[PDB]
Design a protein around this nucleic acid. Sequence first.
DNA 1: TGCCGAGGCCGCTCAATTGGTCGTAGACAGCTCTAGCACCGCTTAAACGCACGTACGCGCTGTCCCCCGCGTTTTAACCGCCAAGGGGATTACTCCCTAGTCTCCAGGCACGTGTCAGATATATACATCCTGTGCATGTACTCGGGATATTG
Length: 50
Amino acid sequence: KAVSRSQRAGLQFPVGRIHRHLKSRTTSHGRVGATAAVYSAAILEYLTAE
DNA sequence: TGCCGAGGCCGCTCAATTGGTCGTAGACAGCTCTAGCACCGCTTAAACGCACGTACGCGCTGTCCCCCGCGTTTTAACCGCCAAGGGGATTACTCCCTAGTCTCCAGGCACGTGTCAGATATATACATCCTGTGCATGTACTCGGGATATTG
């Protein structure tokens, strides 16, 4: 049974659709997995203010 | 009449700009770096651009049908003005304080290297999440009639 990384952060937003998005805006180099979990929850958190 | 009074043209003297000449001091141009490490040339096995009916989606098209535009003029005060008054923004000076220079002096840390790890990428298998689709009601809407608020 697969989990989802959204549940391990505790977030409603898609932590793995981000990551794949960031990996397309990246010079020629990679992106840490712990970036998607404070990339998200600093896009959610504008929702629930907007 | 008178007188003269009031009247209208021309060399000193001073006070900014303007352009000139003096001399001297770092800072610019250039050399040789030399030195080295990037550009190139030379292969390779490579990804990704690209020239090209057809299904067909929608951009554009020929109609009628009405408000908001279009036109007028009264007026209404908005907006402009001028002139006066008061002060507060301004000017010119004297005293004053520190901005700025230099110089000495230390160690803080930004700089740099020296090793090599926990990081994240990439593959394959894959299950699952998420999209596109199809599908009832529930509301937010437009209307009509009356109450409350506010303008003149």
